[PDB]
């Protein structure tokens, strides 16, 4: 078990595609296609992304007294718009050459690029999927989503069965349109979750209940009333009002409260809680 610098590591893993920009060729073979710029965009985009996460990981600042966490959700929302753009672009291209011009990508150009493209993008996407699973990173999930579209690469266009015996036409249209609807949807949902962490949305009901249970069960407390929750990137923010006994000394009240705090802090490691203690002046 390493730490959230696991996400730091994926960010360069995106810059693995640095070798893919070199696994392009002009001096090796004087021929040019378009997927040398998509992967030049990638270097920039996901290099920015590395910088943004590196900002995201900084601890409490002078003028960021809470996290820098949100940087991730911004970075997400940024990417989700750009990925949501490329996907409408490719869905409208899906109905565009629904053989309105014609299946034109016929040049059997050295497809050893697009098969290698798959193979090293496949490699990335899974390392990415591994970190997404290990650490819930908003930021890396978005950067993955794009590469998940790049994995939608078609050196899987039929050449023997090919198109289809004329009358019932076939081209990229069915696939290039299909990916478009799914990835638009996928980026759209992705973004919606980003803005939703940017609004200070509450924790999942599950986590919320755990907190309620931890608290109400506890020896010292009698009631607990105001419970607000949110997370910025990894770290989650929890506040609550605990209702201890009116006549308790403060040092004692603070003890029960410190414990309840300390409990919540074991259960959601990384978290930041703050307990207001009330006596009995609540109906």
Report the phi/psi class of residue 235: left, alpha or beta, with left for phi > 0 and alpha for psi in -120 to 50: beta
> Which residue's CB atom is positioned nearest to Hg ion?
120
Which 30-69 positions form the footprint of a copy of itself (CB under 8 A)?
Answer: 62-68
Three-state SS at 56: helix
- Which residues form the interface with Zn ion (CB under 5 A)? 38, 42, 61, 64, 150, 241, 278
Angle at 106 between CA 100 and CA 107, to 5 degrees: 140
Question: What sign does the CA torsion over 180, 185, 189, 192 have?
Answer: positive
- Residue 65 contacts which entry, Zn ion, a copy of itself, Hg ion, none (Cβ below 5-8 A, type-dependent): a copy of itself
Residue 59 beta carbon to a copy of itself: minimum distance, rounded to whole angstroms: 13
- Residue 120 contacts which entry, Zn ion, a copy of itself, Hg ion, none (Cβ below 5-8 A, type-dependent): Hg ion
Is residue 169 part of an annotated ligand binding site?
Answer: no
Q: Which range of residues in 39-47, 88-96, 250-258, 262-270 is near a copy of itself by CB under 8 A?
A: 250-258
**CA separation for the pair 71, 54 (Å, rounded):** 9
DSSP-assigned letter for residue 135: S
**CA separation for the pair 204, 194 (Å, rounded):** 15
Residue 191 beta carbon to Zn ion: minimum distance, rounded to whole angstroms: 17
Which 58-117 positions form the footprint of a copy of itself (CB under 8 A)?
Answer: 62-68, 70-71, 74
What residues make contact with Hg ion under the rule CB under 5 A?
120, 222, 245, 280
């Amino acid at each position: 078990l390493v730490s959230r610098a696991a996400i730091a590591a994926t960010a360069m893993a995106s810059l693995l595609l640095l070798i893919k920009i070199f696994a392009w060729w002009y001096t090796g073979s004087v021929s040019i296609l378009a997927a040398l710029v998509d992967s030049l965009v990638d270097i920039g985009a996901s290099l920015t992304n590395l910088l943004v996460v590196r900002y995201s990981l900084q601890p409490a600042d002078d003028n960021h007294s809470f996290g820098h966490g949100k940087a991730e959700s911004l970075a997400a929302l940024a990417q989700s718009m750009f990925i949501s753009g490329s996907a409408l672009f490719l869905f409208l291209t899906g109905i565009q050459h629904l053989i309105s011009p014609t299946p034109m990508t016929d040049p059997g150009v050295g497809v050893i690029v697009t098969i290698v493209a798959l193979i090293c993008t496949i490699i990335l996407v899974s390392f990415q999927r591994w970190v997404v699973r290990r650490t819930q990173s908003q930021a890396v999930r978005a950067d993955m989503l794009h590469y998940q579209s790049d994995v939608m690469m078609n050196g899987a266009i039929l050449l023997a069965l090919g198109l289809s015996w004329y009358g019932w036409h076939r081209a990229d249209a069915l696939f290039a349109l299909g990916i478009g609807i799914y990835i638009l949807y996928s980026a759209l949902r992705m973004g919606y979750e980003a803005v939703q962490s940017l609004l200070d949305r509450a924790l999942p009901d599950e986590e919320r209940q755990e907190i309620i249970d931890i608290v109400t069960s506890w020896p010292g407390v009698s009631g607990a009333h105001d419970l607000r929750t949110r997370q910025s990137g990894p770290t989650r923010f929890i506040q609550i009002h605990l209702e201890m006994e009116d006549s308790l000394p403060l040092v004692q009240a603070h003890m029960v409260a410190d414990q309840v705090e300390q409990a919540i802090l074991r259960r959601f490691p990384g978290s930041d809680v703050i307990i207001h203690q009330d006596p009995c002046s609540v109906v």
